[PDB]
Write a protein that binds this ligand. Structure first.
Ligand SMILES: [Cl-]
Ligand SMILES: [Cl-]
Ligand SMILES: [Mg+2]
Ligand SMILES: [Mg+2]
Ligand SMILES: [Mg+2]
Lengths: 111, 243, 235, 244, 240, 206, 231, 250, 241
């Protein structure tokens, strides 16, 4: 039977300072015991000083980041180029993820 | 009366006045022609230069369908585009199911049935374009001309627009003087001349020439635009004939 | 007859232009914007003395930071308000923040032209939408059934609109206080109203950053009416 | 488009009337008169057939009087074809109620629903209304014997005695004159026939130009019987009252 | 589906179909609503060109929407049934989700919203009906009386009348009803309602219907003899 | 992939191009389990004048498909004239591929154009299309992969091609229990359409 | 006359009156100018107000980082069409990782406007658009009309008294086309062009609206004190 | 596109007339005469075969149609409208009855279903009424023999005998004189031929006249034997020869 | 008078749109003729190519509906082709559903029923065409069935359609009075075509070249049209007798 999910491995890490914040992640991509790429970035600048990574199943991870990047774009169009605050981005991402509650994105997201 | 107010209504004559009214819009448009040749077809059109501000060569009117069919039209330009969009869908579904590219007579009926459908109901308007189209298929070269009513026939030469009668007269001379046939490269040159001669009926604004062609030998059976040296060669030939 | 979405020879939509005539028949509504807040005031206009005037609801809350006044076929405004309230709350749910006054107005105006042969006719009501947000501050918008909205420093709509607008032209300046604006709405309303202005046949409201959108009591407005009469007699 | 040919069947006049409903009533006023009279121990339904031909099969015919269920019947005035559409709907509605509650449908409930259908055709859908007026005659254990009428507007009202169709003005005056509350069925039978006999546009009232029906409790002990009169039975009741 | 826009604007800014629906209301039998200190009374006219009627089974003019709210109307009778049915359904739906019966204002707002929806929906005409909705909110003793109309506007009234010759009875109520002191008792409120109808009706026999609504779902309809006593009393005081 | 208890068309079918055109060949046997439901089946079926196919897999599925294809090509002919063999194969593919989960149909398409001469397209269970010089299919084809690869030659004559098909199917029948009966053949050339039949007494003792 | 009730009806001379009446709405609209060089493309727009108390109606809308338009006529119709362009630009990015060509943008608008002119019930769009952009074939300027007709140009203008600016650009063609690698000078030429369509009124700080796109310049709009440089 | 005619094309006029139904009846009046007579042991239905051209084969065009084995139909008015009604009538007899009860519907109920279809063309959106009047003759076990007329409005009436179309006024008068309740089937056929000769102008023979009966069961026309309860169709179309035999002793 | 614009009854019980569709039939100014032999059915029609620029091979009003059925149209070509495409689809579907080739008369009835719908339903206009279907039916033999905008249809011994239809009709009538039979008593289809052309020449009074005619022939198991050279060969035989 066809299994729509897969595990691309890797790990990510976010730390916040006083006037800064870092989002790290390894560049290795894998399936089972094979290496797919030694350099495949999964931490992305999404605009409005928001960085994002969605680790786990890469196809779902890419789809999510792609949709959020697009959400930022339309936020500017619909609200007079207003900067999307990090708290507003977080709530928006919740709705992206929960929208597929019954066929989930298999990812751990950090912004 | 009032028989001309609604589409798909027969008059006491047995006529659909709304379709005849659409023909008037076609007659108002710029001149376009089609010339059938030995192993293919040639299309040409008059582009009126309304202003110096128009970018030369960058308002293309002739349209390709699939990779082997060329379409040109006179009248309401948007209506022509709508018809070509449908043509591309019709050609795509044919190739999807039957593998082979759509034959020209096959393609001609697809447009014909679509245009004819727009004379069946009062909730739609007839097409405000006469469309000259054709190409090369397994059975050889074909040229067609389709009218607002849905009527189409095969043609040796075809013309429509404001200078159709001038162009028709010039086309008839070619058919008489070349019974064995006209070559592809010759037809391009002739097409230019006929557009320049047909421009006498629209001579306030000066114009820009645009030509395309399909030929089994010259273009390998595919639709291509005539550009550069071959275009300028055809323009010079036309310039020499008017003087 | 003729189509609902038909253009006139002058290049205007018949039904939109006719709906504007309906709005001219409606009761007067005035709005003034200041740096200390935005004031909204309306003429209630009871058709008979037996009608309990407090049940006339022509000023309405959309969210805590956005208010609304209406004029024209006021029944048509119910679904517009319903949409505005849902839009405002929905945006807060999706983005954990207050929604911009301009974005709210744009959402309401998108309904306007969704008519034809969607609903059967345009809305027969104009709206004054007042609010505050962090970016553009205190704002006043005039939303029409044409789908168009203008921002205004001050604006009057309804039967006495052209007379009131000319008065607002002279009286408005950029340094108006909130109290000055309150009196100015009452002053101009009393001028254009048929019956004599009092606390029962006129209603005031405002929106401030601190306290949000508030409809004034009949006791509070009555004192502002008394304060207004005294100041005009004082010179 | 098609806007050009729309009659706009569901609109108001400047005076606040529904054009099509008014014109449907005008149509009904030319239909054969139908009378309903409610007595203390039963109900009478009488109706005049529309100008009969001598070669019409009279015994196996049904034009005016229809059976909705065992306890309810209707007299028709207007387009018969329209009435049959509504009758089959009413018959189904009665069976739905019986299936749901295991009880025979109360008369008013059936009347209301049928009247609500007529109302719908006047407010939406862009269709012409049903050119029909009914007289409902029925019995239930709540209100006992009941007479109602409905018309193309979808408005219904209850009656002790009522007429629909042609010459209702004259017919209603005669009923109002001779009707009284302590009346029996046999007396109501006589009143129904006498009224038709005077309001008729025909020369003389005969058995072949009539449809007749009663709803009595004349069955054995506490149960209702519907009697749709046969031709010979109408002939006898016409002689018995001294009309022929 | 039938899509035609029947309700549309005219050059002068009027929606004729809505205004013609008001004419249908003006044709309808008179209906009056008067609210006292602790009650509301709904009076209704019944035309007397209809004899041989069966008053047991004939649809009553005043309808119960819930045990605590009533609705009377003027205009097209068939149209009124559709509004009453929708209102009754919404009343039970409100109890189901909010676990509390509707307020009179809420029920009115719903009915008014339905009427409005039919003024800008394709394929439908407006309701040829104006309603008087009266009652008492749950656990509340303040009387409530609202009016609606085809356009969809609604408002609260101390006293109000609708239907044919309503401008005459409104004239009567405007001078006879005191805001500072409304009818203190049930008898006073009913009498004022009957008086107001007697300016228009004709005879006080089987032409007037009266329905009294009191707090905590206490609704009762008066009989012929009970109403006739008010008619007999008013006429004797009049001859003065 | 077969539905339970449905008729099985497991076969010995093949189509072979040659100098003058193409020849289709097939056995005659149908089974439900080990019982031979039909021993004289015709598995060679016409979708157009000179476009035929060999059927294997499910009897019901292949019949339903072939009937639809015949309908499409008849409608194609009325509008656009005679269809190519490639066109016919494309219509088969479209049905087999788009309904790959509900169908069990291993079809070989074979036709004769005047321009393109004899052509053979095979369509396995997946719905893929493969244009080949010759093709074999059906339960019994496994046993003759070796034989057919060693013995096939391009541009054979009619008599040689008939012998090649006869010997091949004879072996397939001999070793496959799901194959048997008579050996039917259909010859497609410019000359026309010719039907051939060969009985057990002849082909068994080859 | 009898043939202008709806868009589905042709006149005896072959005209569509509803489409022509939609074209009339553009002529009533406020003037806007478009022009381009080889490196940059510029939009200049005269904004209009209801009165002194009101704001000035925004004429220019961004569609993507490399494309946008200015409007003249019914503003809500421009919002519908600009939204459609935003979606099409966006579809091209998500599906093909490809910036939408300005020429295709025009083709898509043409086909969307056309469908509204051949069907019963609907109506033509009542707005004209000037689309500018920078794609893989350099700078572009398009003119959209609600008849469906889209035209690529070096420069143009639409709205009331647009003939004055259109004449100026026709004279200045040879000059402004060669303003390469110089944004401020190309704007100056556009501001001088729109000035030929002014009557009684002059260009003020909250009246003028400018937008630019080019080689190393994303589509950006300038309003308020940011346009004081060009007065 | 799409059918935008969702509104009625038949509406009430101020006088209360339904114009399109009236006009449909006018079309029936113009139509060729047809009639039906009921006997004690059968029913007869007849009409003239108005040929459009002498080159046309009038056998191919059947004005008298079988609906069920025991029910037949004839018309006056517009032929095409009649043809599609027969198609719909045959189908509805199966879908709404035979597929439910395992037997053919009685005459009155099939008539009722046809009437319903014609009524809907009077009220439904974007359609005109049917321009025909039908005469439906039939037999069933519990009602015996019966004859019905169906008008464009959807109204239907049972008849002892009647006529519709061109010369219906005169033909009905002729039938009133001749009809009695003791008529045998052969007597009814004789009267039908006499009545029809008055309205027909040109040739009067078996090739220009179409006539069918509902009478005794016909085992020979059933097509099979072995089931005793199945005894054959009561509907029979008289041949050209059978008509001419009765025209000699006329 | 909107009763003349859509298909609803006029006061006198008429459908003017249907009547006007009949007048559209003759808009092409072409006459057609159909006759039956023993083994075949022949149909002939005039071919007029006025424009010199036209490709004459593409100018046709005869259609091959199925392998067995042929159809000639009198009326404008767009409506003609509309009817042709539908008939082709209907004939193909019939074969798929019911397992045998659609008969000529059944297809005629089907197309006639479709035409009837347009006379009753408002949104659809009638097609301004008269469709003449021909075949050699496996049950009924040689067959001619003709459809019109009214939805009427009937079988024919022989028939003619067009502006000068009546002259052709009486010419054929007078022949069948003389021969005393329902068909052309002739063995080969070649001579039945010669009969058809001969009697059209007599009725219309015009002579025909190879390019002035268009011929369709139905035999058992196939219908086919004749080329210019096939007709020329046929014209030679007539002249030599
Ligand atoms: Cl099989
Ligand atoms: Cl059919
Ligand atoms: Mg074996
Ligand atoms: Mg053909
Ligand atoms: Mg029609």
């Amino acid at each position: 039977q066809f299994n729509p999910y897969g595990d691309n491995g890797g790990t990510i890490l976010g730390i916040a300072g006083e006037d800064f914040a870092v989002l790290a992640g390894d560049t290795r991509n894998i399936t089972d015991y094979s290496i797919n790429s030694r350099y495949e970035p999964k931490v992305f600048d999404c605009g409005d000083n928001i960085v994002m990574s969605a680790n786990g199943f890469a196809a779902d991870g890419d789809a999510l980041v792609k949709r959020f990047k697009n959400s930022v774009k339309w936020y500017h169009f619909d609200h007079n180029d207003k900067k999307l605050s990090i708290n507003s981005a977080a709530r928006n991402i919740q709705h992206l993820l929960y929208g597929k509650r019954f066929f989930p994105y298999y990812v751990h997201t950090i912004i | 009366t009032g028989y001309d107010l609604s589409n798909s209504v027969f008059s006491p004559d047995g006529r659909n006045f709304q379709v005849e009214y659409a023909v008037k819009a076609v007659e108002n448009g710029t001149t376009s022609i089609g010339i059938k040749c030995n192993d293919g077809v040639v299309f040409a059109v008059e582009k009126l230069i309304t202003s110096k501000l128009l970018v030369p060569q960058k308002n293309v009117k002739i349209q390709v369908v699939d990779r082997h069919i060329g379409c040109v039209y006179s009248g309401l330009i948007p209506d022509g585009r709508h018809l070509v969009n449908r043509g591309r869908e019709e050609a795509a579904s044919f190739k999807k199911l039957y593998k082979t590219p759509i034959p020209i007579p096959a393609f001609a009926d697809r447009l014909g049935q679509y245009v004819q459908a727009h004379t069946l109901y009062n909730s739609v308007r007839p097409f405000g374009v006469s469309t000259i189209f054709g190409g090369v298929d397994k059975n050889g070269a074909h040229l067609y001309m389709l009218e607002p009513s849905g009527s189409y026939w095969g043609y040796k030469g075809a013309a429509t627009g404001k200078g159709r009668q001038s162009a028709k007269a010039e086309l008839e001379k070619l058919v008489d003087h070349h019974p064995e046939g006209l070559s592809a490269r010759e037809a391009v040159k002739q097409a230019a001349k006929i557009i320049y001669l047909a421009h006498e009926d629209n001579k306030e604004k000066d114009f820009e020439l645009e030509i395309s062609w399909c030929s089994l030998s010259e273009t390998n059976g595919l639709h291509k635009f005539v550009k550069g040296d071959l275009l300028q060669e055809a323009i010079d030939f036309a310039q020499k004939e008017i003087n | 007859d003729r189509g609902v979405s038909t253009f006139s020879p002058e290049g205007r939509l018949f039904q939109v232009e006719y709906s504007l005539e309906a709005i001219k028949l409606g009761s007067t509504a005035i709005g003034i914007a200041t740096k200390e807040g935005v004031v909204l005031g309306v003429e209630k206009r009871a058709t008979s003395p037996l009608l309990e005037s407090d049940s006339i609801e022509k000023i309405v809350e959309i969210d805590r930071h956005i208010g609304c006044a209406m004029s024209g076929l006021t029944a048509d405004a119910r679904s517009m308000i319903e949409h505005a309230r849902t839009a405002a709350v929905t945006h807060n749910l999706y983005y954990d923040e207050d929604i911009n006054v301009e974005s709210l107005t744009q959402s309401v105006c998108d309904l306007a032209l969704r008519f034809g042969e969607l609903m059967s006719r345009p809305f027969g009501v104009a709206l004054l939408i007042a609010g505050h947000d962090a970016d553009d501050g205190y704002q006043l918008f005039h939303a029409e059934p044409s789908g168009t909205f203008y921002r205004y420093n001050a604006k009057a709509i309804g039967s006495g609109s052209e007379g009131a607008q000319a008065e607002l032209l002279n009286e408005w300046h950029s340094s108006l206080t909130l109290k000055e604006a309150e009196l100015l709405v009452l002053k101009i309303l009393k001028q254009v109203m048929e019956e004599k202005l009092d606390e029962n046949n006129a209603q005031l409201s405002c929106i401030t950053k601190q306290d949000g959108f508030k409809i004034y009591d009949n006791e509070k407005t009555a004192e502002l009416i008394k304060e207004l009469k005294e100041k005009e007699a004082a010179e | 488009g098609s806007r050009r040919y729309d009659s706009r069947t569901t609109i108001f006049s400047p005076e606040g009337r529904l054009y099509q409903v008014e014109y449907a009533l005008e149509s009904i006023s030319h239909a054969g008169t139908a009378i309903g009279i409610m007595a203390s121990d039963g109900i009478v339904l009488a109706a005049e057939r529309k100008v009969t031909s001598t070669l019409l099969e009279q015994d196996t015919s049904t034009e005016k009087l229809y059976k909705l269920n065992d306890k309810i019947a209707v007299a028709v005035a207007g387009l018969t074809a329209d009435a049959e559409i509504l009758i089959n709907t009413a018959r189904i509605h009665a069976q739905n109620y019986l299936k749901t509650y295991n009880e025979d449908i109360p008369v008013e409930i059936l009347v209301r629903r049928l009247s609500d259908i007529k109302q719908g055709y006047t407010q939406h859908g862009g269709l012409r209304p049903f050119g029909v007026s009914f007289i409902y005659a029925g019995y239930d254990d709540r209100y006992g014997y009941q007479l109602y009428t409905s018309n193309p507007s979808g408005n219904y009202t209850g009656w002790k005695a009522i007429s629909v169709g042609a010459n209702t003005s004259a017919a209603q005056t005669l009923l109002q004159m001779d009707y009284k509350d302590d009346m029996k069925v046999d007396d109501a039978i006589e009143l129904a026939l006498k009224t038709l006999s005077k309001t008729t546009d025909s020369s003389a009232l005969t058995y072949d130009r009539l449809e007749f029906a009663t709803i009595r409790k004349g069955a054995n002990d506490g149960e209702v019987y519907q009697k749709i009169f046969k031709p010979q039975e109408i002939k006898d009741i016409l002689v018995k009252t001294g009309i022929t | 589906g039938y899509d035609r826009a029947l309700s549309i604007f005219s050059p002068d800014g009027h929606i004729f179909q809505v205004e013609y629906a008001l004419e249908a209301v003006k044709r309808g039998t008179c209906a009056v609503g008067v609210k006292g200190k602790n009650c509301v009374v709904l009076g209704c006219e019944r035309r007397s060109t209809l004899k041989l009627q069966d008053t047991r089974i004939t649809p009553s003019k005043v309808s119960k929407i819930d045990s605590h709210v009533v609705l009377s109307f003027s205009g097209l009778n068939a149209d009124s049934r559709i509004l009453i049915e929708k209102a009754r359904v919404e009343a039970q739906s409100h109890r189901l989700t909010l676990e509390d019966p509707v307020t009179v204002e809420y029920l009115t707002r719903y009915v008014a919203g339905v009427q409005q929806r039919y003024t800008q929906s394709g394929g439908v005409r407006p309701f040829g009906v104006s309603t008087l909705i009266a009652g008492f909110d749950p656990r509340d003793d303040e009387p409530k009386l609202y009016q609606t109309e085809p356009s969809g506007i609604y408002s609260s009234w101390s006293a109000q009348t609708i239907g044919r010759n309503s401008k005459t009875v409104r004239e009567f109520l405007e001078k006879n009803y005191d805001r500072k002191e409304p009818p203190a008792t049930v008898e006073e409120c009913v009498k004022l309602t009957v008086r107001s109808l007697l300016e228009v009706v004709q005879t006080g026999a089987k032409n007037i219907e009266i329905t009294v609504v009191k707090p905590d779902s206490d609704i009762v309809a008066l009989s012929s003899e009970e109403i006739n006593q008010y008619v007999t009393q008013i006429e004797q005081e009049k001859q003065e | 992939r077969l539905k339970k208890g449905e008729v099985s068309l497991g076969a010995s079918i093949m189509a072979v191009t040659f100098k003058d055109g193409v020849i289709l060949g097939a056995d005659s046997r149908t089974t439900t389990g080990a019982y031979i439901a039909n021993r004289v089946t015709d598995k060679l079926t016409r979708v157009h004048d000179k476009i035929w196919c060999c059927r294997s897999g499910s009897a019901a599925d292949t019949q339903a498909i072939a009937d639809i294809v015949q309908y499409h090509l008849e409608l194609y002919t009325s509008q656009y004239g005679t269809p190519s063999t490639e066109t016919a194969a494309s219509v088969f593919k479209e049905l087999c591929y788009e309904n790959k989960d509900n169908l069990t149909a291993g079809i070989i398409v074979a036709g004769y154009d005047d321009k393109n001469k004899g052509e053979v397209y095979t369509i396995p269970l997946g719905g893929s299309v493969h244009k080949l010089p010759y093709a074999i299919a059906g339960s019994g084809s496994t046993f003759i992969y070796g034989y057919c690869d060693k013995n096939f030659r391009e541009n054979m004559s009619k008599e040689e091609t008939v012998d090649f098909i006869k010997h091949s199917l004879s072996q397939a029948i001999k070793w496959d229990g799901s194959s048997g009966g008579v050996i039917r053949m259909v010859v497609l050339t410019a000359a026309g359409v010719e039907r051939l039949i060969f009985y057990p007494d002849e082909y068994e003792q080859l | 006359n009898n043939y202008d009730g709806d868009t589905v009806t042709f006149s005896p001379t072959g005209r569509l009156f509803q489409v022509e009446y939609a074209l009339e709405a553009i002529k009533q609209g406020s003037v806007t100018v478009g022009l381009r060089s080889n490196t940059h493309a510029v939009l200049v727009a005269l904004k209009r107000n209801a009165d002194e108390l009101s704001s000035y109606q925004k004429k220019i809308i961004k569609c993507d980082e490399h494309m946008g338009l200015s409007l003249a006529g019914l503003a809500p119709d421009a919002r519908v069409l600009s939204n459609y362009l935003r979606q099409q630009c966006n579809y091209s990015s998500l599906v093909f990782n490809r910036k939408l060509a300005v020429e295709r943008a025009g083709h898509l608008l043409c086909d969307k406007a056309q469908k509204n002119t051949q069907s019963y019930g609907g109506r033509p769009y009542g707005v004209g658009l000037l689309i500018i952009g920078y794609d893989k074939s350099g700078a572009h300027l398009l003119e959209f009309q609600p008849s469906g007709n889209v035209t690529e140009l070096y420069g143009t203008a639409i709205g009331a008294r647009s003939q004055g600016a259109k004449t100026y650009l026709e004279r200045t063609l040879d000059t402004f086309i060669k303003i390469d690698g110089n944004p401020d000078e190309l704007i100056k030429a556009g501001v001088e062009a729109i000035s030929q369509s002014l009557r009684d009124e002059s260009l003020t700080v909250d009246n003028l609206s400018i937008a630019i796109v080019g080689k190393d310049t994303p589509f950006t709009i300038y309003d308020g004190e940011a346009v004081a440089k060009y007065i | 596109m799409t059918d935008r005619y969702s509104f009625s094309l038949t509406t009430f006029s101020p006088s209360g007339k339904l114009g399109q139904i009236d006009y449909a009846l006018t079309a029936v009046k113009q139509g060729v005469t047809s009639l039906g007579i009921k006997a004690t042991n059968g029913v007869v239905i007849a009409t003239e075969k108005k040929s459009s051209s002498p080159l046309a084969m009038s056998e191919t065009l059947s004005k008298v149609s079988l609906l069920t084995p025991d029910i037949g139909a004839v018309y006056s008015g517009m032929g095409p409208d009649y043809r599609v009604l027969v198609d719909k009538s045959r189908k509805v007899a199966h879908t709404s009855y035979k597929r439910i009860y395992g037997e053919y519907p009685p005459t009155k109920l099939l008539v009722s279903e046809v009437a319903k279809i014609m009524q809907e063309a009077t009220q439904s959106g974007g359609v005109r009424p049917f321009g025909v009047s039908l005469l439906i003759a039939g037999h069933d076990e519990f009602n015996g023999f019966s004859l019905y007329q169906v008008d464009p409005s959807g109204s239907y009436f049972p008849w002892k005998a009647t006529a519709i179309g061109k010369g219906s006024v005169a033909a009905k008068t002729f039938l009133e004189k001749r009809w009695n309740d003791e008529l045998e089937l052969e007597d009814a056929i004789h009267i039908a031929l006499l009545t029809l000769k008055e309205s027909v102008e040109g040739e009067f023979n078996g090739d220009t006249i179409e006539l069918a009966i509902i009478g005794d069961e016909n085992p020979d026309l059933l097509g099979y034997t072995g089931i005793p309860t199945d005894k054959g169709p009561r509907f029979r179309k008289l041949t050209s020869q059978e008509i001419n035999d009765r025209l000699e002793a006329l | 008078g909107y009763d003349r614009h859509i298909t609803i009854f006029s006061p006198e019980g008429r459908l003017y749109q249907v009547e006007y569709a009949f007048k559209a039939t003759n808009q092409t100014n072409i006459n057609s003729l159909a006759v039956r032999g023993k083994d075949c059915t022949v149909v002939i029609s005039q071919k007029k190519v006025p424009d010199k620029l036209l490709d004459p091979t593409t100018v046709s009003y005869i259609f091959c509906i199925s392998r067995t059925i042929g159809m000639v149209v009198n009326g404008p070509i767009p409506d003609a082709r509309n009817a042709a495409l539908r008939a082709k689809a209907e004939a193909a579907e019939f074969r798929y559903k019911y397992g045998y080739d659609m008969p000529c008369d059944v297809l005629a009835k089907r197309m006639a029923n479709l035409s009837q719908i347009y006379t009753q339903r408002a949104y659809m206009r009638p097609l301004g065409v008269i469709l003449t279907f021909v075949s050699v039916d496996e049950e009924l033999g040689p067959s001619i069935y003709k459809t019109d905008p009214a939805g009427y249809y009937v079988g024919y011994k022989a028939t003619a359609t067009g502006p000068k239809q009546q002259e052709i009709t009486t010419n054929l009538e007078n022949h069948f009075k003389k021969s005393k039979i329902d068909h052309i008593n002739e063995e080969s289809w070649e001579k039945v075509v010669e009969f058809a052309i001969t009697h059209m020449i007599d009725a219309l009074g015009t002579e025909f070249s190879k390019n002035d005619l268009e011929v369709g022939v139905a035999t058992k198991d196939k219908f086919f049209t004749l080329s210019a050279e096939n007709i020329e060969e046929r014209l030679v035989a007539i002249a030599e007798q």
